[PDB]
Amino acid sequence: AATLPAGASQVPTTPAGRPMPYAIRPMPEDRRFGYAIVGLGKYALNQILPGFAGCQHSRIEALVSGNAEKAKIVAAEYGVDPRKIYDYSNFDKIAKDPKIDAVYIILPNSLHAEFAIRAFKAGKHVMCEKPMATSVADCQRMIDAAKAANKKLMIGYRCHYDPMNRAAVKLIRENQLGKLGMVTTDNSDVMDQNDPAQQWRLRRELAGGGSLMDIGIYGLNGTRYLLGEEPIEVRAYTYSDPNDERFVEVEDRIIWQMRFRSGALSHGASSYSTTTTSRFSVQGDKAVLLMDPATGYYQNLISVQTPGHANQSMMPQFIMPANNQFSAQLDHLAEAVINNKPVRSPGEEGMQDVRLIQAIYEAARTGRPVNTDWGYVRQGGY
Amino acid sequence: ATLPAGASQVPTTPAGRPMPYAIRPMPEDRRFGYAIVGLGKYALNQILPGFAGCQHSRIEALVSGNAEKAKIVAAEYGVDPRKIYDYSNFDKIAKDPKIDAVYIILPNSLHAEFAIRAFKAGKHVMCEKPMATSVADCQRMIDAAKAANKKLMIGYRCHYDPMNRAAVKLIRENQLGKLGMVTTDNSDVMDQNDPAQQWRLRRELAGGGSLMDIGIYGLNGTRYLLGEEPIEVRAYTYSDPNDERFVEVEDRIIWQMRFRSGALSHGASSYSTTTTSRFSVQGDKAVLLMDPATGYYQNLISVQTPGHANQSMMPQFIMPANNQFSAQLDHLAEAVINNKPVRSPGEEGMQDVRLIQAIYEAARTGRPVNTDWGYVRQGGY
Amino acid sequence: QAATLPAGASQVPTTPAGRPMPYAIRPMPEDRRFGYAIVGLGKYALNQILPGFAGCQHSRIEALVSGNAEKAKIVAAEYGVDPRKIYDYSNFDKIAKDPKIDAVYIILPNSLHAEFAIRAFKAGKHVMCEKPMATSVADCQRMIDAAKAANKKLMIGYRCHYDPMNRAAVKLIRENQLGKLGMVTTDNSDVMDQNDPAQQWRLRRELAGGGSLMDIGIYGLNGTRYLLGEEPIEVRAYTYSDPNDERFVEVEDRIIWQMRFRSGALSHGASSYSTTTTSRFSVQGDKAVLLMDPATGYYQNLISVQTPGHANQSMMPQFIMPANNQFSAQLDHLAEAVINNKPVRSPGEEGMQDVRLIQAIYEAARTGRPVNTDWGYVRQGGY
């Protein structure tokens, strides 16, 4: 005679306490790691600050901006106390607060170097957004300062902590595509000069470059970790409508071709004049991987294609096997510290992309191939 | 060819800039305080984490029968430890004005009593689905809400899910033409070892099987997609008699309904088959496929015609609408703040319970059950 | 060392020269041994079947049977059929005098399947008959009896039994990729247009035998059966049609039926004459869920096995054709069955089973009570 299992039969029919429920998504754990967010801009307020909620070891300790009115408003929304609101002048004072373990620099590309360096002098860990800086030299000075302060330097490569991108790298390493031979990337988005956030991006001094530096870097970096190797030479070409006021100083569209030591090739482009595009294609001799969206803030989708098949993968509809890229990025530094472990996106990684972006820019300017076989080594893997 | 003024006027040195463009819901305030009742699977996996994205809501207190757990959860959400209640002193919430409403996330059979006690404590009530395990209990919850002059809202997250609302919108815009056939399926493998599932296998606590638990999504969904109520239902249920999970509640049940407009629907719910959340709405111009239809995340809808499949889902960079969980929480807040009725009132929850009761009767007797009792959806679907 | 070209490439002449038979990436024509007499030059015959012969590997059109001489003459010319090989419904029986007519393919209104199938067997021919088999269980049996008496094969036109994607779906299910099966859902619909000549007999119960269930719901019914690989033991149903709609005065528009199988699996499906194109099947197991959509299209079928975080889709390739199209395959299947003295996958008994089940479903809808269908049908040769 079929009867209910023990567990079900033991459940009281009256109000009673029960055990900790099964977890189907990352549960909050602690808030030991305190960050100091610098630059309350579009990315900071739209993605990063809201991203702390899901963190399992991170919290917002202080804010840093030149707009006190805004800073006050953003502080009240995140319970940050007014007393811990720094401006770009007193920033160095963060040194007097041991509760500020690290700083997260979300300022224009040109101001990354200086504040990162000032942050290390203040004896703090540094989370710096990409592109690292607007010059290779500055990246090195950022790295030296990191070593000197004996703190960690991490670049905001969210995709290195995105579930779907991680799944993509895994299937590739498992040889589901076979011998890799051709990678294709495209990253685009219509430039709106009226958007406060986009205005400095049109300034060569502030941005360091056009679409490549801002978004093309996703195809560049992605080609590198998807392939799991570095380019030995690059060739490129760029074109911008001469009559378009948006590109007087920075490039609109640029295309770059690369060759790797394994024999694999790649061709990708970035654009400021075409609508939303984030697509990566990795061709092997067994199958072809299509990541589309490839690097979105949300809804990434990948597919392994073979004649007659399209095996798609995306985040589940009810469970959450891994944390979102933002919250995961924030906790990755926090964890690297408390565990005395190297970071997956070290300053050396961000410097590699800057060097590569310069070799690419130089290739487009000269119209000749630029050797990039300078022996960079990815510590810890891709 | 010169650079725009805005670009040219941006300083080369560190300086303050204006409030950035918002591409997703920004936090605004935390004026509506909630007392969360029942630190279970839904509370800790979806609800509490959903407060962060709210624009007018916050966690003020916790109500639990497990002291150690309550402390751990309170610490994780910065909840004042002195604001942790148990099921005995729950009534004392009446003394804290910072507690605007309560959110009942307890087993179905306990919804009514804690909802009514909450109204006597002068609080607004947010209660999870299914509303209750009897039509009479639903009514009492409603009588209590009116006596206390407080709002009663049932946890129909799909009533605040972007994709579901987009689905309702195109249907109302007549993109499918004349509606004639809806198909629904909601399923998931019942694991009797999961503490959260244990009470679901008990008739006294659950009030029913898969229909009361997840089939209700198809039922409720069929109603808001067609934008009308069923006037007749038929159904059949079957469960493996040797499976210990279904000794008291149904595993699989199939229900068929007819609407005044002439539209028909057939749907099912299952406790023994893997994850399924699929809705289909056939019109004479196009067919809508929602799959996933009612997920926590990743919903996807598609309007299909010969040679075309127009899919819609949440964007990859922008977020034009708040997630269903945060939106649901704020909806009660805003309704109270702005003196407006809620989209998912107690009457809506009660309609489902009555219909579910009718479906069970139909499956029991094997005869059709008339449901043409004139229910009116206040404020639309 | 340094690479050199392989022998094959190095041996290719640089001048015009004959080469070997090429690699095959699609079914190649082979012969035209099996001759068909097509009965009823209507919508299905002219849009799908006659054109479907070109892709066959053993079948050909030998003669035509039509009641419209003007039309038969035109079609005969389009397919190179001997003008003398055109029969009408009166001299039909004379096909017995032509040895090059191995079989007939009845593509007539449902109510006329039985008599022409029987006249064909008496004419000593094999028979391919469209679905639904007939309009009465008794007539189905009369067709089977006539086949047995003539010692000829009887095959029903279940094209999906020879459709690549449907076979792929059946295969992954048998491989247990979905786990234990518990819930099947089907929907088959298309807007009925009474001004279409082909639909006019479908609105007449005497000619059609029934409404949407008999016409297209049968795909959901038959599909549930070969997807689960078993037979229902009981059915329950309900039907409804706008009482003021002239299309449904004699046959049903929408009908919903649910069934239970001996394995314990359940199913709920529907067919509709008033909603647009729908051909969707879903099979839920405790390990995965299969979604076939399109499920039974003339073309472009697509299937997907879904699990949290995954959707593995399968469809016909873009450059190769691993298996022949369902129409050509169906036709060749009877041909090969005769030549190799083997039974067909879709025999008269299979078609009769659906007709019995459909009658049971209509009965259940009419009485509002369940109907026991545990009558012991056994699928010879598997599903």
Next chain:
Amino acid sequence: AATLPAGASQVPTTPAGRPMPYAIRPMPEDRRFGYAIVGLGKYALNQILPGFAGCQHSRIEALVSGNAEKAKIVAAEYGVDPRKIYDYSNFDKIAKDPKIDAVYIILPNSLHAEFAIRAFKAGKHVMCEKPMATSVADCQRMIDAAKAANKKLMIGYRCHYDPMNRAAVKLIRENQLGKLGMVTTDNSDVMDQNDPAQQWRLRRELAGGGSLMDIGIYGLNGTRYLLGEEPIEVRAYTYSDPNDERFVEVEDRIIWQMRFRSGALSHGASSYSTTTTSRFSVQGDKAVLLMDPATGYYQNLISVQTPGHANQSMMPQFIMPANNQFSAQLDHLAEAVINNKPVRSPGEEGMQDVRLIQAIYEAARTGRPVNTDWGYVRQGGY
């Protein structure tokens, strides 16, 4: 008081003749235009011959083959009169048969010109497979011979008669994508030297080139008809594993990028060492078009993408609004001759591709950009 409509009530209950039925797919009409198929190879026997069945005005009249035994086998399979089987020596005798309206050259690239010219001298129209020829000069010779015999010259660009490709061109011209700015193409497939058909493809003298001449041309030609304009300059690079016996004479992978007079850019590639890929992407400032499969023999699929939307189109599941590309291509020449109209894919169109391919190879060899602003005008649109 509902009653049945006239049509239904008038249907006899006994066997009776009925009208012509509604057409839901292209119906056969006539077989007035006769072809002589030259070269019974992989494409001919797998796609072209089987493609005649779906034609509305075309038929196979004769076969030209160097393999007499294969020719007789194929002849019997298609009801071709045994006497209508020619070989490469008596090929010119087709001039004596008025039933042969045209020839279809499905021979190796290097032999196209030769037989097309002999066909024109034979007074026949000519359908010739792509790539047109292995030299620009040979392309012109074919055109000259066409004009000399006053017969039409059409190149086998099936995609110019493929429903989905046409649908893609139509929506672009309707401005559903906005201002076009970036096109990406990829056409790949694993080269198998054991396949008799691929053996001449590895011979430069017979192929004229590697993957670009064979399948890259789809991306090239596609970029042109999707943009609806011509490139004014190209840049390219190619690489092939030096130890692979497959690429001793022809290239494996080649990447090319182009700039158009409208300002639009493009970057594509073709590969002989990676599995099945046929993907076209067209980015505008309003939407992005993804064609994938882009140029398949079957199952093409297109999708217009915008944030939160993916509107896909493909061939219906029950109706066939337009004929398949193969039958359509064959009928296109037939209709053009019968209606005294030019063909959508004239010799000049095939020649443009060959010239552009020459420019791309030249650009790959010199590592310098090549100007292609030579004034080609698409007669009749793309």
